[PDB]
């Protein structure tokens, strides 16, 4: 505005619609909230109990060392807490990673149409984004490697499994990619979808944990059902993990969120149950898509990408009509040819039943 | 410094770069009996806020509204201002980091008080700013000295806390407004009002006195009187253009969904806030009595703590802090620079904690003679 402070940095001077904003725009409530990959299955009953029990302690700051959470993670994962950093979701950690490495004008390599929050952080720190097209619906490992080399980029992003296509690579291919990078380039390996992936997609911890130039990011926001709590963590060498202590808000963690995450980790039975429900919902979405003449894509995530078989304007019309006519909130990718697709999050049966009724009608109404 | 296993191409700045109570419990192998060192409000948030948290628990699978619309609307109503003037962040500490990021280029001078709020200094250093520190004047942040340092350095950023941490002192609103209006319009003032709720009304500038200034931002929190430190909810008051700059560099979905619900409920329960601010005031008086009974000198306060001059040197004050913890499980803190570090800082608390402190402090002082 004309009212802004006149001496923001030159970078600052040069610089997704959420579901609540959609409701305000459309003047209606969302009937199926299946567009942001939030887990409507919810966190475990034991986690809800832990939150309610923790409420009375919310006057205290969280432990700035995150000791109990790091220990719990370390015990679960079979690695040391010295290898672990805690942050405000993967999104918060991604911002910190960009800050740690990216100077104004530095090139940063990612996939064309890949996870947009990463791109937001890169731009906000003055990085120059270098994008690599997907190769047959997968993030192109060989192409990412070459772009890094061409630019001598200090940072590269890979999500495995991928958002928004839901695709994945075998662990051995991801490891080979990571090992091939120059040690002067940091890889952030975004494993937001660890919990829903086939085990053979995920590198063993020991395969990468000694590399100073690899950091892996995981979250409680997806399968664990705690998106609103903002708890993420990274796995790296201890020297790389320690760097977060130079630039993090030490008391920044939500005390209730940390309690919830510790409880979530403890309830592996619930995680097993919910991941089976997510898988079932992926199959249901695939059936619904196919019944409407669309092409669902294989997925290792908590959503299904669906190829709508025409162009981007058709996919957009489907998203908009689902919201306008049925109060169904989905999303779509933002670049060709990925944007031939829509992306539908998994959900309980009530939402699936609504989607099953609505999607054919939308497709019929567009013909 | 960085270790041999750290990524070898962290920025040159990065390469060049308080004990919490939980760590103290681990070190001493005991639970804290009186947690009165981090200015957390042991009075707690309102009963209605606890209910709101428990009711919101089932929705925690959803991300918070990235626009923070309902919270901004609630704050706008409470404050009597436009929601366009309001930015939301992860406490004042989170907002301070953002403010530094918005203004501070490597090497830029940033003015603050010597021994003033340390998290601000942490953020400045972390963004490559050059800290320019101004000694306190008689236990107050030296407005004249801050203004001189800004002028000398043409500093783009200056920090003022009113009321102050760690001394608890304050300036009248008219002096703060005069200070703010004397700064160059090319210098941003962050006016840290963490202690708004416990301050005398005449310490606080009216919103209208500063709200049209593009170079003033005021920061407030739910962490202190409202009893929600663990929820991490802070907000700022500024012009809309200044508020909008946060949208360029903030983690849009970063807010705790339960924390937002708690903050909205906390705002609604002004009867509870009134009650708790009176309890905090009473506890300050009790701490003053306890201090005086042990031959120490409590300082006036407009915060939720009392600074106490222990009348000797920094090593004496340190010994008091350490013995209270080791021998009695009592957690307090002290300032980190002379001559402020002649002092200890004791947070307010309910009667159970005050009673423990009243028994323990004389024993500690006696043991040190
Ligand atoms: C959902 C998601 C994130 C963000 O996770 P948070 O931990 O909630 O910040 C990051 N990366 C990918 C690929 C995601 O899908
Ligand atoms: C306690 C305190 C803060 C931190 O507040 P949060 O909102 O919890 O981040 C900031 N400034 C001062 C002066 C404080 O006393």
UniProtKB/TrEMBL annotation, chain B:
The modification N6-(pyridoxal phosphate)lysine (covalent) is found at residue 224. The keyword Transferase applies. Pathway: Amino-acid biosynthesis. The modification Cysteine sulfenic acid (-SOH) is found at residue 196. Residues 37-361 form the Aminotransferase class I/classII large domain. Keywords: Aminotransferase, Pyridoxal phosphate, Transferase. One of its GO terms (molecular function) is pyridoxal phosphate binding. It comes from Rhizobium meliloti (strain 1021) (Ensifer meliloti). The gene is hisC4. This is Probable histidinol-phosphate aminotransferase. InterPro entries: Aminotrans_II_pyridoxalP_BS, Aminotransferase_I/II_large, HistidinolP_aminotransfase, PyrdxlP-dep_Trfase, PyrdxlP-dep_Trfase_major, PyrdxlP-dep_Trfase_small. Pfam families: Aminotran_1_2. Its EC number is 2.6.1.9. Pyridoxal 5'-phosphate binds at residues 92-93, 117, 165, 195, 221, 223, 232. Belongs to the class-II pyridoxal-phosphate-dependent aminotransferase family. Histidinol-phosphate aminotransferase subfamily. Signal peptide: none annotated. Its cofactor is pyridoxal 5'-phosphate. The lineage of its organism: Bacteria, Pseudomonadati, Pseudomonadota, Alphaproteobacteria, Hyphomicrobiales. It is an enzyme of class 2 (transferase).
């Amino acid at each position: 505005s004309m009212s802004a402070f006149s001496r923001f940095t030159p970078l600052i001077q040069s610089l997704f619609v959420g579901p609540e904003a959609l409701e305000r725009q459309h003047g209606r409530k969302i009937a199926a909230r299946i567009g942001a990959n939030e887990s409507g299955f919810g966190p475990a009953p034991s986690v809800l109990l832990a939150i309610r029990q923790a409420a009375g302690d919310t006057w205290k700051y969280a432990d700035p060392e995150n000791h109990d959470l790091k220990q719990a993670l370390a015990r679960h994962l079979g690695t040391s807490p010295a290898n672990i950093a805690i942050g405000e979701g993967i999104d918060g950690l991604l911002g910190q990673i960009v800050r740690l490495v990216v100077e104004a004008g530095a090139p940063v390599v990612t996939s064309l149409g890949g996870y947009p929050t990463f791109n937001y952080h890169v731009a906000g720190h003055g990085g120059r984004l270098v994008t690599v097209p997907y190769a047959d619906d997968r993030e192109d490992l060989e192409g990412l490697l070459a772009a890094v080399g061409r630019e001598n980029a200090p940072l590269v992003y890979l999500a495995n499994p991928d958002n928004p296509m839901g695709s994945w690579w075998p662990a051995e291919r991801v490891v080979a990619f990571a090992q091939a990078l120059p040690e002067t380039t940091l890889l952030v390996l975004d494993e937001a979808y660890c919990e829903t992936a086939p085990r053979d997609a995920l590198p063993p911890i020991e395969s990468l944990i000694d590399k100073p130039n690899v950091i892996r990011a995981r979250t409680f926001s997806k399968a664990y059902g705690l998106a609103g709590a903002r708890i993420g963590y990274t796995l790296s060498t201890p020297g790389t993990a320690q760097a977060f202590d130079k630039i993090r808000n030490h008391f920044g963690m939500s005390r209730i969120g940390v309690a919830a995450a510790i409880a979530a980790l403890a309830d592996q039975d619930y995680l097993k149950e919910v991941t089976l429900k997510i898988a079932n919902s992926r199959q249901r979405i695939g059936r619904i898509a196919a019944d409407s003449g669309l092409a669902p894509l294989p997925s290792a995530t908590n959503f299904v990408a669906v190829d709508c078989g025409k162009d981007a304007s058709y996919a957009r019309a489907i998203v908009d009509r689902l919201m306008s006519d049925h109060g169904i909130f989905i999303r779509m990718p933002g670049v060709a040819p990925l944007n031939r697709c829509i992306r539908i999050s998994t959900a309980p049966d009530a939402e699936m039943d609504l989607l099953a009724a609505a999607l054919p009608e939308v497709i019929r109404s567009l013909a």
